[PDB]
Structure formats: structure tokens, C-alpha cells
Design a protein around this ligand. Sequence first.
Ligand SMILES: [Cl-]
Ligand SMILES: [Cl-]
Ligand SMILES: [Cl-]
Length: 139
Amino acid sequence: GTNNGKQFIHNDTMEGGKLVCREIYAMNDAASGILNPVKMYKYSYDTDQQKTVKSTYAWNIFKNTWETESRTVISRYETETSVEYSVWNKEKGSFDLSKKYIYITDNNNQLIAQYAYKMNSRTNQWILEKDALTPIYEN
Ligand SMILES: [Cl-]
Ligand SMILES: [Cl-]
Ligand SMILES: [Cl-]
């Protein structure tokens, strides 16, 4: 970003009008001008179950391969959207639930309330971090 002085560019792959892959690059050499891969997002849609899965991969510079970094599951329930963010646990071979977000709108798509949670790894229960009504609904 602007504050850290690091520039990135992306390349999107579309399929049937939807984004299925987004690859992130950075320019790390001028003797070549080659854009180096940094991150890759893969999107898995399921219209019937109203669920989108975004899988994130990070470029492993030692192995020169992609490695599983995280997973975001977006579930739609009309006025309610639930987002679960999980981190890949390398030495477990599974995804650990980390953050959860809930967005509630009215029937006109105006946000009513937003909630954020962080997973307590000791108790396996979500900790509330944020809960706020928007000014129009604050009444
Ligand atoms: Cl980007
Ligand atoms: Cl494309
Ligand atoms: Cl939607």
C-alpha cells in the first residue's frame, strides 16, 4: 500500500460472468520486469446453497509453489450475511476458525447492524469484538 510503499497488481480469471481466480503480483526486479506471484484467490460459488468459498494461497519462495493460507466462507440468508474466516494450520492439516462477521440489512439493503467475533481457541467459543447499529437504525 501507500503507507508501506509496496505496490501490487492483480489478474482476474472470469467464468460464466463470475470471478473464479484472482492472482496478486509484485514487481521485484528491473533487470527482468517480471511480475512475481505473491497471492492467489480461488472462488467456489454455490447459488443453490447461497454459499461462496474463497480459498487463499501464498507463494512459497523456498519451494516455488502455492501453499494454503486461509479460507473465507460467505453464507447468504437474504437480510443476513455470515462470513467465517479460517486460517490453515500447517502442523494439523486443517483450517482453524479465526474470525466471524455478521451483516444484517433491512429489505432495501440498508445495513441495520454489523457484528465481528474472534475465536477463543481455549474454549472453542466466539468472542464478540464489535456490535454496532448504523445511525439511520440507531433509533
Ligand atoms: Cl490487488
Ligand atoms: Cl477471464
Ligand atoms: Cl449476494
